[PDB]
Short mmCIF file of C-alpha atoms and ligand atoms in Angstrom, two decimals:
data_model
loop_
_atom_site.label_atom_id
_atom_site.label_comp_id
_atom_site.label_asym_id
_atom_site.label_seq_id
_atom_site.Cartn_x
_atom_site.Cartn_y
_atom_site.Cartn_z
CA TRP N 1 0.00 0.00 0.00
CA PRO N 2 2.65 2.63 0.89
CA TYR N 3 5.46 3.75 -1.38
CA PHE N 4 9.04 2.76 -0.59
CA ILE N 5 11.08 5.39 -2.44
CA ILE N 6 14.82 5.09 -3.00
CA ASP N 7 16.12 8.61 -3.60
CA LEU N 8 18.96 8.40 -6.15
CA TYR N 9 19.94 11.98 -5.33
CA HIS N 10 23.78 12.21 -5.37
CA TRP N 11 24.04 9.68 -8.22
CA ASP N 12 26.38 11.43 -10.67
CA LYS N 13 28.79 12.31 -7.83
CA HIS N 14 29.48 8.61 -7.12
CA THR N 15 32.18 6.43 -8.62
CA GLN N 16 31.26 3.62 -11.01
CA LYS N 17 31.88 1.03 -8.28
CA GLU N 18 29.61 2.92 -5.87
CA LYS N 19 26.96 3.23 -8.58
CA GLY N 20 27.12 -0.54 -9.06
CA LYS N 21 26.69 -1.05 -5.32
CA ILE N 22 23.66 1.28 -5.24
CA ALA N 23 22.05 -0.46 -8.22
CA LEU N 24 22.68 -3.84 -6.58
CA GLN N 25 21.11 -2.71 -3.31
CA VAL N 26 18.07 -1.44 -5.23
CA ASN N 27 17.79 -4.82 -6.96
CA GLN N 28 17.98 -6.58 -3.59
CA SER N 29 15.39 -4.14 -2.23
CA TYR N 30 13.01 -5.11 -5.03
CA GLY N 31 13.44 -8.84 -4.52
CA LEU N 32 12.95 -8.35 -0.79
CA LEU N 33 9.80 -6.31 -1.40
CA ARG N 34 8.71 -9.05 -3.82
CA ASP N 35 8.87 -11.48 -0.87
CA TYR N 36 6.37 -9.39 1.12
CA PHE N 37 3.86 -7.21 -0.74
CA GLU N 38 5.53 -0.45 -4.74
CA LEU N 39 9.26 0.26 -4.90
CA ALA N 40 9.96 3.69 -6.38
CA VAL N 41 13.28 5.16 -7.54
CA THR N 42 13.49 8.93 -7.95
CA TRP N 43 16.23 10.78 -9.84
CA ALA N 44 16.34 7.54 -11.85
CA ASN N 45 18.51 8.55 -14.81
CA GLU N 46 19.36 6.36 -17.80
CA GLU N 47 22.70 5.21 -16.35
CA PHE N 48 20.92 3.73 -13.32
CA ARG N 49 18.45 1.99 -15.64
CA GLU N 50 21.41 0.56 -17.56
CA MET N 51 23.13 -0.56 -14.35
CA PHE N 52 19.93 -1.92 -12.77
CA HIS N 53 20.11 -5.65 -13.55
CA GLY N 54 16.52 -6.31 -12.54
CA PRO N 55 13.05 -5.92 -14.05
CA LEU N 56 12.61 -2.21 -14.78
CA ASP N 57 8.99 -2.98 -15.72
CA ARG N 58 8.36 -4.25 -12.17
CA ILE N 59 9.45 -1.10 -10.32
CA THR N 60 8.53 2.57 -10.59
CA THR N 61 11.37 4.73 -11.93
CA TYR N 62 11.12 8.53 -12.10
CA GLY N 63 13.97 10.53 -13.61
CA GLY N 64 13.10 13.87 -12.00
CA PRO N 65 13.03 15.19 -8.44
CA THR N 66 11.51 13.17 -5.61
CA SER N 67 9.33 16.14 -4.66
CA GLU N 68 7.73 16.17 -8.11
CA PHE N 69 6.98 12.44 -7.85
CA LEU N 70 5.41 12.98 -4.43
CA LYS N 71 3.27 15.88 -5.67
CA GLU N 72 2.13 13.98 -8.77
CA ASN N 73 0.82 11.18 -6.52
CA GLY N 74 -0.83 13.50 -3.99
CA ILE N 75 1.63 12.88 -1.14
CA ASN N 76 2.40 15.88 1.07
CA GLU N 77 4.01 14.09 4.04
CA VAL N 78 6.71 11.42 4.06
CA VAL N 79 8.91 9.48 6.45
CA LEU N 80 12.62 9.98 5.74
CA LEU N 81 14.78 7.18 7.11
CA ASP N 82 17.64 9.21 8.58
CA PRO N 83 20.26 7.86 11.02
CA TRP N 84 20.89 11.44 12.19
CA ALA N 85 17.27 12.03 13.23
CA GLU N 86 16.60 12.55 16.92
CA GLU N 87 13.23 10.76 16.86
CA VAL N 88 12.94 6.98 16.44
CA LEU N 89 10.65 5.38 13.87
CA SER N 90 7.53 3.93 15.50
CA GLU N 91 4.05 2.62 14.72
CA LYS N 92 2.80 6.23 14.72
CA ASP N 93 4.60 6.65 11.37
CA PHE N 94 3.17 3.60 9.57
CA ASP N 95 0.15 5.57 8.30
CA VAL N 96 2.38 7.72 6.08
CA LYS N 97 1.95 6.96 2.38
CA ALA N 98 5.67 7.12 1.51
CA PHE N 99 8.91 6.03 3.18
CA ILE N 100 12.13 7.42 1.71
CA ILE N 101 15.53 5.69 1.87
CA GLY N 102 18.51 7.58 0.47
CA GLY N 103 20.36 6.03 -2.45
CA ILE N 104 23.65 6.50 -0.62
CA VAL N 105 26.73 4.33 -0.09
CA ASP N 106 29.73 5.14 2.10
CA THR N 107 33.40 4.61 1.26
CA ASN N 108 33.94 7.62 6.02
CA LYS N 109 30.27 8.36 6.73
CA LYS N 110 29.31 12.06 6.46
CA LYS N 111 25.89 13.60 7.18
CA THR N 112 24.18 13.11 3.82
CA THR N 113 20.58 11.95 4.36
CA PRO N 114 19.13 15.05 6.14
CA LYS N 115 19.99 17.13 3.06
CA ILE N 116 17.30 15.12 1.25
CA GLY N 117 14.88 16.22 3.96
CA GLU N 118 15.88 19.87 3.61
CA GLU N 119 15.35 19.59 -0.15
CA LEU N 120 11.92 18.02 0.34
CA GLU N 121 10.83 20.63 2.89
CA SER N 122 12.12 23.39 0.61
CA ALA N 123 9.71 22.00 -2.00
CA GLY N 124 6.77 22.05 0.42
CA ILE N 125 6.86 18.42 1.62
CA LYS N 126 6.34 17.71 5.31
CA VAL N 127 9.14 15.36 6.36
CA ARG N 128 9.21 13.07 9.40
CA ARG N 129 12.90 12.33 9.99
CA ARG N 130 13.00 8.92 11.69
CA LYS N 131 16.00 6.89 12.81
CA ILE N 132 16.16 3.13 13.35
CA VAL N 133 18.01 2.11 16.51
CA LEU N 134 19.14 -1.07 18.27
CA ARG N 135 18.89 -0.53 22.05
CA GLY N 136 18.67 3.23 21.61
CA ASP N 137 21.80 3.25 19.43
CA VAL N 138 22.29 3.36 15.67
CA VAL N 139 25.40 1.19 16.11
CA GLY N 140 24.56 -2.37 15.11
CA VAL N 141 21.84 -1.29 12.66
CA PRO N 142 22.80 -2.34 9.11
CA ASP N 143 22.71 0.70 6.85
CA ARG N 144 22.42 -1.05 3.48
CA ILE N 145 19.34 0.14 1.58
CA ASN N 146 17.89 -3.38 1.38
CA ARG N 147 18.61 -4.05 5.07
CA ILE N 148 16.83 -0.85 6.14
CA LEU N 149 13.87 -1.84 3.97
CA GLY N 150 13.88 -5.30 5.54
CA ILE N 151 13.82 -3.84 9.05
CA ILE N 152 10.85 -1.63 8.14
CA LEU N 153 8.98 -4.50 6.48
CA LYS N 154 9.56 -6.80 9.46
CA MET N 155 8.07 -4.12 11.71
CA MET N 156 5.17 -3.20 9.42
CA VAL N 157 4.14 -6.61 8.04
CA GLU N 158 5.34 -9.18 10.60
CA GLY N 159 4.69 -7.01 13.67
CA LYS N 160 8.26 -7.43 14.93
CA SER N 161 9.64 -4.95 17.42
CA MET N 162 12.46 -2.72 16.19
CA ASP N 163 15.06 -4.62 18.23
CA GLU N 164 13.82 -7.95 16.85
CA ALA N 165 13.68 -6.64 13.27
CA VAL N 166 17.13 -5.03 13.47
CA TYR N 167 18.77 -8.10 15.00
CA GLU N 168 17.15 -10.40 12.43
CA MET N 169 18.44 -8.16 9.61
CA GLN N 170 21.81 -7.67 11.35
C1 SAM P 1 24.39 3.49 3.64
S1 SAM P 1 23.10 4.51 4.39
C2 SAM P 1 23.85 6.14 4.13
C3 SAM P 1 24.62 6.64 5.35
C4 SAM P 1 25.23 8.02 5.16
N1 SAM P 1 26.39 8.19 6.02
C5 SAM P 1 24.19 9.10 5.45
O1 SAM P 1 24.38 9.93 6.34
O2 SAM P 1 23.14 9.17 4.81
C6 SAM P 1 21.82 4.46 3.10
C7 SAM P 1 20.42 4.86 3.56
O3 SAM P 1 19.91 3.98 4.54
C8 SAM P 1 19.13 4.70 5.48
N2 SAM P 1 19.58 4.39 6.85
C9 SAM P 1 20.79 3.85 7.18
N3 SAM P 1 20.85 3.72 8.52
C10 SAM P 1 19.70 4.19 9.06
C11 SAM P 1 19.25 4.29 10.37
N4 SAM P 1 20.01 3.88 11.38
N5 SAM P 1 18.00 4.82 10.61
C12 SAM P 1 17.21 5.25 9.56
N6 SAM P 1 17.67 5.14 8.27
C13 SAM P 1 18.89 4.61 8.01
C14 SAM P 1 19.31 6.18 5.21
O4 SAM P 1 18.10 6.71 4.71
C15 SAM P 1 20.37 6.26 4.14
O5 SAM P 1 20.02 7.21 3.16
#
């Protein structure tokens, strides 16, 4: 029912190896979502479509800004999965019609995801910045795009607690 959007913002600033890792994690995110239930990829340029080794016809790919995609589908509020957020994701956020995971890979960390939120709010989108924690700490939480999606799906579909979902995906 809800959209799981992978924001490919930052794409052209990545190396070819990092692009391949992002595309792989998107492919794994699709197969994982295929084992549950609606996967959307914004800023989805032609190079990503060429690197994506999965069924492009089975996912939603939008080449332009995430905000435009959200507005075209009547979504004014989203949940942005952000490890730097101060508030933890909870069941009070599962009524939102779109969850956004940043198409980001590290090579050592940097504060990259909240810039997506600032961009969305600058375009008029209400953004709930939500972090996933294990025992109140982001340490131990896998940050791969597919792993974050798996944690969310285990909480939303299987009713697992966050600690259970994180540890199972850890
Ligand atoms: C490899 S992480 C990127 C980490 C990068 N240092 C940053 O600050 O965005 C890829 C995506 O997974 C999501 N993510 C990773 N860890 C998270 C966490 N602990 N809580 C919520 N979202 C997380 C973020 O949305 C991020 O865009």
